[PDB]
């Protein structure tokens, strides 16, 4: 609903819409889900899209995505959402996101970050200077 939120969500939409055709398909959603360790079936992917597909055209457009994000903001448990997100990044489950783990996640998400880009993400999140990102640092990065 705010213009700042719309801009953030537009950037989020772009990650799913890899071909920039303005729609998210089952292929695109599946690609992202699998990159996050999930193993959905095509039937599941179609059902996921169907839920947010207001016009029944089989894909998600930005307006539909916005409606979905507004719904998420109001119904979802924000604290649990951040904990589950941290666990996605922390592949080995040791409590810290390493630069390698971050790069692996981003690469899976189709973002082929440069060495400099990865270093910047870690440096900015790494408040305590140990070279990795702990949970508190992650929370601070996402909420402030």
């Amino acid at each position: 609903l705010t213009e700042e939120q719309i801009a953030e969500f537009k950037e989020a939409f772009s990650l799913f819409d890899k071909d920039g055709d303005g729609t998210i398909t089952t292929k695109e959603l599946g690609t992202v889900m699998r990159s996050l360790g999930q193993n959905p079936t095509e039937a599941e992917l179609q059902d996921m899209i169907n839920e947010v597909d207001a016009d029944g055209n089989g894909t998600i457009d930005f307006p539909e995505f916005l409606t979905m994000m507004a719904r998420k903001m109001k119904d979802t448990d924000s604290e649990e959402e951040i904990r589950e997100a941290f666990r996605v990044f922390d592949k080995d489950g040791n409590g810290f996101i390493s630069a390698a783990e971050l790069r692996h996640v981003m690469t899976n998400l189709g973002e082929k970050l440069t060495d400099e880009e990865v270093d910047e993400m870690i440096r900015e999140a790494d408040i305590d200077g140990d070279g990795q990102v702990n949970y508190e640092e992650f929370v601070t990065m996402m909420t402030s």
């Binding site: 950037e11 989020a12 799913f16 994000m69 981003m106 998400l109 973002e111 910047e120 996402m142």
Partner: peptide, 25 residues
Amino acid sequence: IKKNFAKSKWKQAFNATAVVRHMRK
């Protein structure tokens, strides 16, 4: 790299997880 890159890129990745989490149930 501009100073604002990190916050925005972290949030984009976070949102990808949040969207999948929300849409799957």
